[PDB]
Structure 1
Amino acid sequence: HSPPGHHSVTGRPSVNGLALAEYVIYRGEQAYPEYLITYQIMRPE
C-alpha cells in the first residue's frame, strides 16, 4: 500500500549525489513492461 493520498514512493538518494532515484508502486497495473532488453555487461579494458 502507498502512503495515504500517494500513488508511489520516490526513493531519492541524499548521500551519493550521482545516484539517481528508485521508485515503488503498490499495484502491478501502474507499470507496463514495454521493452525487454537482452545484454551482457562488458569487462572494462
Structure 2
Amino acid sequence: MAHSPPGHHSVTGRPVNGLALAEYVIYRGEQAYPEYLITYQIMRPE
C-alpha cells in the first residue's frame, strides 16, 4: 500500500465530458468502516 500525497489523507479522482461521479482512494484501512452489506441482482433492461 502506497502513502497519501504529503499533507493529504486521501485522493479524489475528479471525472471528461461526463455524468460520472467521483472515485476516492485512502491509504489506511482504518479510514473506512463497512456500515451496510447490500445483497442484490442487476436487472435485465426491458
TM-score (norm. length: structure 2): 0.91
Which ranges of structure 1 fall in alignment gaps of 5 or more residues? none
Report the CA distance shift for 1:44/1:23 in structure 2 as closer, same or farther (over 3 A): same
Q: Residues 4-44 of structure 1, C-alpha deviation per residue, up to 9 Å, x if partnerless?
A: 0000000011x042000000000000000000000000000
How many residues were matched structurally?
Answer: 44
RMSD of aligned Cα (Å): 0.7
**Could you list the runs of 5+ residues in structure 2 that have no partner in the other structure?**
none
Query: Following superposition, which runs of at least 4 residues in structure 1 exceed 4 angstroms of deviation?
Result: none
TM-score (norm 1): 0.93
